Amino acid sequence: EVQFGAYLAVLLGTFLPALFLVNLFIQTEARKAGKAGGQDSD
Amino acid sequence: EVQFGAYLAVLLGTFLPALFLVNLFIQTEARKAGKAGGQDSD
Amino acid sequence: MLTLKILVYTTVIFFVSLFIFGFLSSDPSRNPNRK
Amino acid sequence: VSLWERFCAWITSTENRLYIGWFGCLMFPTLLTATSCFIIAFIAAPPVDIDGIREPVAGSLLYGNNIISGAVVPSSNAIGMHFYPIWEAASIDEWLYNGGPYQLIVLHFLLGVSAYMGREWELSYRLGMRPWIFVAFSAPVAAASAVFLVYPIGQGSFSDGMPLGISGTFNFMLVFQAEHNILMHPFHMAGVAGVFGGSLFSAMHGSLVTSSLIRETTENESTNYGYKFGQEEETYNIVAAHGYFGRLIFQYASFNNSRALHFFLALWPVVGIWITSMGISTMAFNLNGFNFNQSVVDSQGRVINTWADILNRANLGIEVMHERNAHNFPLDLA
Amino acid sequence: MTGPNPNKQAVELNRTSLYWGLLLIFVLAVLFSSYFFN
Amino acid sequence: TEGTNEWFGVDDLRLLAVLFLGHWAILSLWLGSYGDSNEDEDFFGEIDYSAR
Amino acid sequence: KSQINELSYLQVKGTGLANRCAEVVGEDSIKPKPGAKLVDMCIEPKAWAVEEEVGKAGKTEKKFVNSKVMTRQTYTLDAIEGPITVDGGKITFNEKEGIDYAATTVQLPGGERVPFLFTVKDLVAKGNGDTFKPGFQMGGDFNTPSYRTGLFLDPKGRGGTTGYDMAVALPALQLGEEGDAELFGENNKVFDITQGRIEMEVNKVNAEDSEIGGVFVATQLSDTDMGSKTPKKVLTKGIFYAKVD
Amino acid sequence: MEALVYTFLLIGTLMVIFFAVFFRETPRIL
Amino acid sequence: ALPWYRVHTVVLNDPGRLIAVHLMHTALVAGWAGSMALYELAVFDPSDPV
Ligand code: CLA
Ligand code: CLA
Ligand code: CLA
Ligand code: CLA
Ligand code: CLA
Ligand SMILES: CC(C)=CCC/C(C)=C/CC/C(C)=C/CC/C(C)=C/CC/C(C)=C/CC/C(C)=C/CC/C(C)=C/CC/C(C)=C/CC/C(C)=C/CC1=CC(=O)C(C)=C(C)C1=O
Ligand SMILES: CCCCCCCCCCCCCCCC(=O)OC[C@H](CO[C@@H]1O[C@H](CS(=O)(=O)O)[C@@H](O)[C@H](O)[C@H]1O)OC(=O)CCCCCCCCCCCCCCC
Ligand SMILES: CCCCCCCCCCCCCCCC(=O)OC[C@H](COP(=O)(O)OC[C@@H](O)CO)OC(=O)CCCCCCCCCCCCCCC
Ligand code: OEX
Ligand SMILES: [Fe+2]
Numbered sequence: 001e002v003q004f005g006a007y008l009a010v011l012l013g014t015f016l017p018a019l020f021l022v023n024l025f026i027q028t029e030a031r032k033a034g035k036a037g038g039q040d041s042d
Numbered sequence: 043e044v045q046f047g048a049y050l051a052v053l054l055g056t057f058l059p060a061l062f063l064v065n066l067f068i069q070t071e072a073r074k075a076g077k078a079g080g081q082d083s084d
Numbered sequence: 085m086l087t088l089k090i091l092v093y094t095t096v097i098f099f100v101s102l103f104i105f106g107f108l109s110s111d112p113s114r115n116p117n118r119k
Numbered sequence: 120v121s122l123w124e125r126f127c128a129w130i131t132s133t134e135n136r137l138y139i140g141w142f143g144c145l146m147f148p149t150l151l152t153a154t155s156c157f158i159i160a161f162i163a164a165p166p167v168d169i170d171g172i173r174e175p176v177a178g179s180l181l182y183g184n185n186i187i188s189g190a191v192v193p194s195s196n197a198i199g200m201h202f203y204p205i206w207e208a209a210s211i212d213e214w215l216y217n218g219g220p221y222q223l224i225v226l227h228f229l230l231g232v233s234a235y236m237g238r239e240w241e242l243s244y245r246l247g248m249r250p251w252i253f254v255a256f257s258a259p260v261a262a263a264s265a266v267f268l269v270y271p272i273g274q275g276s277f278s279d280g281m282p283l284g285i286s287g288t289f290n291f292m293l294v295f296q297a298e299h300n301i302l303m304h305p306f307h308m309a310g311v312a313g314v315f316g317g318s319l320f321s322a323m324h325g326s327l328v329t330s331s332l333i334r335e336t337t338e339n340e341s342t343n344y345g346y347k348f349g350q351e352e353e354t355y356n357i358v359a360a361h362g363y364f365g366r367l368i369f370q371y372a373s374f375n376n377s378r379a380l381h382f383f384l385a386l387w388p389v390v391g392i393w394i395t396s397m398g399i400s401t402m403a404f405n406l407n408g409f410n411f412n413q414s415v416v417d418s419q420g421r422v423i424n425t426w427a428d429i430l431n432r433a434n435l436g437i438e439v440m441h442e443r444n445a446h447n448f449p450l451d452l453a
Numbered sequence: 454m455t456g457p458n459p460n461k462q463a464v465e466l467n468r469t470s471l472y473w474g475l476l477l478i479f480v481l482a483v484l485f486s487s488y489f490f491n
Numbered sequence: 492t493e494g495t496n497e498w499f500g501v502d503d504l505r506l507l508a509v510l511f512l513g514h515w516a517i518l519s520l521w522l523g524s525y526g527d528s529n530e531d532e533d534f535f536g537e538i539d540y541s542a543r
Numbered sequence: 544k545s546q547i548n549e550l551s552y553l554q555v556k557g558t559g560l561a562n563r564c565a566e567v568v569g570e571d572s573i574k575p576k577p578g579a580k581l582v583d584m585c586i587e588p589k590a591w592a593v594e595e596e597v598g599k600a601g602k603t604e605k606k607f608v609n610s611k612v613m614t615r616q617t618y619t620l621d622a623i624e625g626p627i628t629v630d631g632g633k634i635t636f637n638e639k640e641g642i643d644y645a646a647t648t649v650q651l652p653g654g655e656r657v658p659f660l661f662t663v664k665d666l667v668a669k670g671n672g673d674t675f676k677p678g679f680q681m682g683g684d685f686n687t688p689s690y691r692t693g694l695f696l697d698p699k700g701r702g703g704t705t706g707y708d709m710a711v712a713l714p715a716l717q718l719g720e721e722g723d724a725e726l727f728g729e730n731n732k733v734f735d736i737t738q739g740r741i742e743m744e745v746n747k748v749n750a751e752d753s754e755i756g757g758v759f760v761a762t763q764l765s766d767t768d769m770g771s772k773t774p775k776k777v778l779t780k781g782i783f784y785a786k787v788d
Numbered sequence: 789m790e791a792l793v794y795t796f797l798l799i800g801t802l803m804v805i806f807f808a809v810f811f812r813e814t815p816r817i818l
Numbered sequence: 819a820l821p822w823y824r825v826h827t828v829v830l831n832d833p834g835r836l837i838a839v840h841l842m843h844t845a846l847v848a849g850w851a852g853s854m855a856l857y858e859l860a861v862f863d864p865s866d867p868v
Contacts, residue, residue: 005048006489008053014482017052019061021474024466024822026065027072031463034076035083041073042340044790052793056800075463084463084819086503088204093506097513102130105521106141107125112538114351116247119540121524124543136810162795173614173648173658180791181860186798192721197615206492209615212650216613349817443696458835460828462820470822494557598867653864799826 133245142238147230153224157283158306160191160220164361170280170445171196175216178284190284194218196445199276221277225267236260258389261396265403266291273403274453297437298451304408306398313391320384325357327360545752562616563587564784567747567756570677573787575634579627582788584641586663586759587619590779591649593657593765595775606780610649613656618647620663627787629673636668638683646690649777659777660690660766663741675755675787677743682742690737690766703732703769730770739763743783756784 033040076083113119128136131140138148156287166175166182169192177184194203194215197411203222208214237255271280281291301307332355335345346354374380402408411427422428438451466474492502501507520531532541544565547555555561564585592607600604604707612618621640627634632648644662651657670681695705700706708730709723710716716723723730741761748755760780829836839845 002490003055004049006043006486006491008049009489010482010486011050013485014059014478016057016061017056018475018478019063019065021466021471021478023061023065023068024464025468025471027068027464028466030069030072031076031465034073035079037077041077048465049793052797056797080462081459082461085206085209089204089502090509091508092206093509094513095148097510098517099148101514101517102144103141106127106130106144108521109123109525110539110541111141113540114131114499115244120543123520124524126520158798162791162798165656173646175656184791186794201493203493210611210613212611213613213615215657216648216650217615348815385798443700458828458832460830460832460835462825462828464820464822464825466822492558598864601868603866769862772845 120331131241131245135241138238138242138245140238140241142234142241146231146234146238149227149234153227153231156220156227157191157224159223161189161283164191164220165215167192167221168195168216169193169218170442171278172444177265178282186285188241188284188286190282190287191221191224192218192287193280193282194221194277196276196278198251199278200271218277221283223282224283225277225280227266229264232260232263255385255389258392261393262399265399270370270403273400273405276453279453284313293437294441297434297441298407299402299405300408300410300434301398302400302408302430303410304398304402306394307408310391310395310398313388313395317388317391320387324380324384327364328355331355331357331359332361372410550766559616562619564782565754565756567749567784569749570747571750572674573750573753573755574674574675575627575629575787577629578640579629579684580788581623581625581627581636581638582786583621583754584623584625584638584783584785585619585621586623586781586783588661588761590780592650592777592778592780593651594777595651608652610651611624612647612649614647618645618661620645620661623663625666633669633671634673634675634681635670636666636758638663638666644688655694657765657775657777658690659763660687661761661763661779662739664688666741668743675748676725677746677748678741679745681745682740685739685741685763686739687739687763687768693732693734693769697732697768701730701732703734725775728770735767735769736762737774752788753788754784756782757785 035041077083127173129135130141130144132138159372160179162179163181164179166177168174169176178190178194184190196443203213203214203217203219205219205223208217208219211219236253236256239256240250242248243250243252267283271277281288288294295301328378332342332345335341335354355425361373361375375381411425413422414425414427415425441451495502499510501510504505533542544567547560547565550560559591564587580682590609591612594605594607595608596603597606597608621642623638623643625636625638625640627636629635643664643666644660645703645731646658646660648658664687666685667683668681669683670679672679694705696702699711701708701711710726710730713723716726723733741759743759744757745755747758758780760778762776762778765777826839829839
């Protein structure tokens with residue numbers, strides 16, 4: 001018998017902070033593509 | 043008695059698609075701040 | 085229960101009197117046409 | 120200069136974020152009290168004797184419900200039509216047992232919606248608009264006052280009023296079918312035609328504008344960015360969409376006038392819901408829909424069944440089962 | 454409102470520091486899962 | 492006592508002094524501007540733009 | 544009283560007066576005749592108490608906590624008739640007809656709602672002496688019927704004398720040799736009769752008006768919903784009033 | 789334990805209604 | 819150009835937004851203590867305090 005609140009602990013302990021760190025990378029590459037002025041800035 | 047896989051259905055059915063739509067907005071504002079060239083482009 | 089009841093008739097006829105004396109306050113003249 | 124003139128200048132200012140107005144003086148206190156009591160009564164509220172037989176029906180989330188089954192239960196059959204505020208209840212526990220918050224929510228709702236309607240008038244006066252958006256909003260105000268106010272009046276109790284919920288809505292619709300036969304009544308027929316027609320002419324008008332848009336964008340960006348806000352140029356070829364629908368059915372069935380076109384979109388649903396909400400009203404006083412049961416007979420005189428007789432046996436199933444303990448006498452007079 | 458803040462800055466995260474922070478979360482998820490499930 | 496036939500639901504004497512001091516407390520505000528004006532000044536309009 | 548009889552119907556309604564028993568004035572003695580028959584005995588309780596496990600300083604002995612009634616003004620009994628038979632040692636009373644039940648529901652600390660049928664059905668009163676006196680004190684047993692008559696349908700649609708007898712939306716429970724015997728108790732609806740003991744006490748009599756009235760105390764057992772739960776002992780107190788004729 | 793999820797969905801829905809009304813992208817001419 | 823561990827240092831030279839931030843930590847602390855105590859009353863059982 002395992003604790004059924006541990007699935008919510010682990011799978012949100014993975015996904016919520018890991019999806020956070022993806023966002024800081026995507027907006028980093030968007031600012032670099034934003035300044036660069038070619039074909040992707042818009 | 044409820045199904046304990048429904049917590050994983052709902053709380054990932056909320057968070058995973060809703061954190062997706064946040065990312066498309068943050069990189070949208072980063073491209074607009076990327077082209078604008080002032081104090082935030084870098 | 086007669087202490088709450090006093091509090092409601094204050095709050096009702098406060099806002100009802102703002103409604104009644106709102107339209108008596110020359111309310112047709114408040115238009116974007118003139119004045 | 121005076122304190123009242125500096126208060127009338129603020130309360131009727133269109134420069135506020137949300138226009139308050141003089142109807143907002145009794146819209147906002149009413150609807151915030153209908154709201155703040157609804158959220159508490161939907162989440163945490165003890166069970167309610169609705170049938171007056173001291174069998175309390177659970178309706179809130181803390182007592183084992185969900186979004187679908189949870190509902191603010193109507194007031195008791197024991198109260199009926201009597202006004203039952205908090206101060207005429209001798210405790211809040213006696214208030215919540217007998218269906219207290221159904222009357223507090225509904226009466227502050229119908230005042231706040233009839234003040235939200237007059238508020239739509241007021242801002243149209245102060246902005247220079249022609250005034251009648253609030254006449255189009257009369258159609259859901261007619262229908263909200265029909266199931267929460269008029270139907271409890273003619274049936275003589277708020278317990279026959281509509282339960283503030285989702286499963287409580289379908290308890291309301293089915294019991295209303297068995298006791299009043301709404302589907303055969305021609306005013307539910309005139310508003311099914313109002314919303315089937317309303318969703319037709321919505322998606323029929325919204326397609327012919329989107330079909331005939333003018334090239335202002337590239338294929339990479341969005342279609343919607345060819346409209347700059349506040350522009351004075353027309354954003355679609357209206358002659359194009361007139362020639363399309365002028366060939367899709369025939370020529371003379373097409374509105375070339377866009378004003379008469381945009382009026383017919385406001386006529387058809389709103390007239391369909393005025394008529395429908397006076398179907399619930401005339402069936403609140405037990406003037407039911409049509410009844411064609413045992414209408415077709417042979418020459419011998421035996422009853423030949425029709426589709427209304429099959430529909431009757433569905434009504435007899437709900438009639439003999441609604442409020443299965445509340446009845447003691449052979450005819451549901453209430 | 455008032456004027457625009459002159460303290461607006463930008464946030465950066467290069468591709469290197471993404472993989473650190475991803476691997477940091479998954480290894481902490483591997484380590485602490487067995488105790489949480491108990 | 493709910494179904495008593497009493498005016499405006501005024502059960503006790505104390506609730507009157509609530510009603511009178513509600514209408515009058517805003518009436519006195521209203522008379523600070525629209526009161527003490529000329530009650531003898533007319534117009535042949537549909538709507539008057541006289542003063543504040 | 545006769546003061547209540549002065550009023551008309553429109554003056555009583557909505558005022559909560561018809562719920563309240565009369566107030567008898569003065570004290571003397573009255574003798575029950577051979578054919579004496581009690582006429583207008585009304586009983587109204589003014590306080591309720593349910594036996595619970597109380598949280599004292601360190602101990603958990605059973606005590607009565609009081610409770611607030613939630614059914615509004617529907618608790619009073621009325622119009623209870625019956626002949627007053629004269630045994631030699633002690634005057635007795637046996638009730639025959641009248642409204643002798645009044646269903647009501649009280650709420651405990653914690654939010655628990657305890658309904659109970661308050662009744663005096665089949666009452667055998669016995670009191671010291673013969674004549675009614677301000678020191679007179681009669682009481683006896685009454686039979687409580689069940690709170691629901693057997694054709695009551697529960698939310699699934701199961702009753703004692705009607706309805707289904709199995710979990711109607713759980714059709715896979717009656718599979719196997721055992722069937723649904725795990726939930727057997729919630730299918731079998733048993734009509735229950737318990738006992739109750741009331742103790743009345745006359746203290747104020749009119750003999751020129753032949754009407755008595757005093758304080759009682761009644762204990763009984765609450766309901767169980769036909770064996771759904773353990774019923775709880777309910778004590779109550781109040782005042783009564785009777786016309787001895 | 790079950791109703792805690794339903795409450796979080798309801799007040800979480802009322803948050804994004806609040807941000808959509810007051811923090812809306814204000815449309816501007818020119 | 820701030821790293822992720824220096825994002826909240828834009829409030830160093832801004833006293834007006836130093837308060838709005840310190841009010842938001844307060845609105846989360848106070849909202850915790852309210853919603854924790856609502857959670858505890860759904861779980862508490864005053865049957866036997868002994
Ligand atoms: C201002 C808006 C507003 C309005 C219109 C109402 C209206 C109502 N509330 Mg509500 N309420 C409000 C705000 C409001 N509330 C607020 C802000 C709160 C929070 C404190 C509450 C809290 C609250 C509670 C807790 C309860 C109510 C209740 C009620 C109902 C009865 C209250 C009552 O006795 O009214 C008093 C009304 C009058 C004395 C009548 C005033 C009408 C005037 C006199 C105009 C009439 C003109 C006259 C006819 C002219 C005659 C001329 C002559 C020559 C003939 C009623 C539907 C009760 C309820 O619904 O229970 C079911 C209840 O229990 N309210
Ligand atoms: C159903 C609500 C409703 C709405 C939205 C309107 C809307 C309007 N009315 Mg109107 N009116 C109504 C009902 C309504 N009316 C009723 C029922 C009466 C008869 C008593 C009147 C009598 C009336 C006159 C005499 C005048 C208006 C005017 C107006 C316009 C400006 C608002 C104003 O000053 O009126 C003030 C608002 C009212 C008089 C009604 C208030 C309705 C409240 C908000 C809700 C309903 C409560 C109920 C009727 C009151 C019961 C009180 C009782 C329980 C104590 C506007 C188009 C004016 C106008 O522009 O005419 C050209 C005007 O001079 N109305
Ligand atoms: C194909 C099937 C079909 C269709 C299309 C309809 C169509 C309709 N039926 Mg019907 N019906 C059917 C089958 C059908 N019926 C059957 C089979 C039965 C028998 C079970 C019934 C029994 C039945 C009943 C018993 C009733 C209907 C009603 C209606 C009407 C509903 C419109 C309405 O209430 O909106 C009007 C809008 C409102 C009531 C909402 C008002 C909302 C207010 C204005 C504001 C609320 C704001 C909200 C709280 C917050 C906003 C958001 C916030 C975040 C700001 C419509 C004409 C109703 C009717 O006749 O009209 C009253 C009705 O009572 N039907
Ligand atoms: C098979 C397709 C079909 C068709 C043709 C209809 C047709 C109709 N339904 Mg129906 N219905 C259907 C499927 C259909 N339904 C389904 C699948 C359901 C759900 C299970 C329902 C549920 C339903 C309900 C509950 C009700 C109807 C009603 C109606 C009537 C009016 C609806 C209306 O005006 O809509 C709006 C659409 C329009 C106004 C567009 C015009 C439609 C008309 C009929 C066409 C006009 C062409 C004309 C006859 C030809 C001459 C012109 C020529 C000179 C060019 C109409 C007889 C209502 C009724 O009973 O009315 C008597 C009603 O109460 N229907
Ligand atoms: C009173 C508390 C307090 C306050 C107001 C600050 C304030 C600050 N610190 Mg500091 N700090 C504190 C305590 C505090 N610190 C403690 C206790 C430590 C030891 C761990 C540090 C170690 C530290 C370092 C090493 C650095 C700072 C930095 C900073 C500055 C920017 C913060 C930043 O960018 O983080 C942004 C943080 C994030 C975007 C996410 C962090 C995610 C954390 C790790 C997990 C999630 C937090 C969790 C939900 C919190 C639960 C509540 C718990 C505290 C009870 C700012 C002036 C930086 C600095 O010097 O500025 C130049 C810096 O480099 N701090
Ligand atoms: C020779 C032999 C072998 C012998 C056999 C004989 C023989 C040949 C027989 C065959 C004949 C035969 C049957 C042929 C007949 C053909 C025929 C008609 C068959 C179809 C059958 C049939 C039932 C048809 C009737 C149904 C029909 C099409 C009804 C039309 C409904 C109708 C009139 C709707 C109008 C609604 C309306 C007003 C819409 C406008 C409102 C709206 C919002 C539109 C949007 C809109 C409109 C605009 O206007 C513009 C501008 C814009 C912007 C815009 O948004
Ligand atoms: C056996 C009995 C026989 C029947 C007996 C009659 C009984 C009473 C009939 C009532 C007739 C009322 C006439 C109203 C005319 C009018 O509305 O003009 C309004 C405009 C005027 O036309 C516009 O008019 C303009 C010219 S002018 O204004 O008319 O001069 C023109 O510029 C524009 O292009 C043109 O569109 O018309 C339109 O915009 C189109 C809408 C027409 C609405 C009439 C249909 C009836 C309502 C629909 C059915 C109810 C809806 C709900 C159903 C569930
Ligand atoms: C309630 C809300 C919950 C909030 C949670 C959200 C925040 C959660 C995530 C934040 C922390 C992210 C850490 C990012 C990590 C990060 O981006 O690193 C980069 C960061 C600093 O890098 P720089 O200064 O080079 O950054 C340049 C910038 O452009 C980008 O940061 O390094 C650190 O801060 C210290 C190093 C930690 C790096 C991890 C080292 C340990 C390695 C992993 C060990 C595991 C393997 C073990 C094997 C045995
Ligand atoms: O409350 Mn609701 O439902 Ca109108 O019918 Mn009579 O009452 Mn009762 O029964 Mn059927
Ligand atoms: Fe349009």
